[PDB]
Structure formats: structure tokens, C-alpha cells
Amino acid sequence: PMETQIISDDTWKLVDEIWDKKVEEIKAEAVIQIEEEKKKPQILMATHFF
């Protein structure tokens, strides 16, 4: 063999960071995806006049 090591051990840490970030975002968004309580129109926005 003539082949010594290649691209890095640092960009592997970068792609591992990206993988972990996306994995945690998916894990979080799979649990707290739906919490809807109410949607009342603010047809009396008091800061405009009062």
C-alpha cells in the first residue's frame, strides 16, 4: 500500500455534528409537534385607539 490517511478526522466531527443536530431536531419535533390551545382573533386591538 501507498495510501496514507485521507480527508480528516475533523470534518467527520463536522458531519457528526450535523447528523446529531438533525437527529435531535427530528426527535424533539416528533414529540412536541402538536400543542394547539386556541386561536382568537384580536378584532379589538386596543393599542390602536385606547
Partner 1 sequence: TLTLVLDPFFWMYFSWTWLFWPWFIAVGLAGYGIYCFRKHWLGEANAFEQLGIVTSVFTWLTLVPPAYFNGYLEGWPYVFFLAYHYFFFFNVSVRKRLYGDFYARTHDPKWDVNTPLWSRILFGVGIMVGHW
Classify the phi-psi angles of 34: left when phi > 0, otherwise alpha if psi is within -120 to 50, otherwise beta.
beta
Sign of CA dihedral 28, 34, 37, 39: positive
Which residue type occupies 21? K
Of 30 and 44, the one with the shorter C-beta distance to partner 1 is 44
Q: Does 44 bind partner 1 (CB under 8 A)?
A: yes
Of 2 and 46, the one with the shorter C-beta distance to partner 1 is 46
Q: Does 1 bind partner 1 (CB under 8 A)?
A: no
Binding span for partner 1 by CB under 8 A among 3-11, 12-20, 28-36, 39-47: 39-47
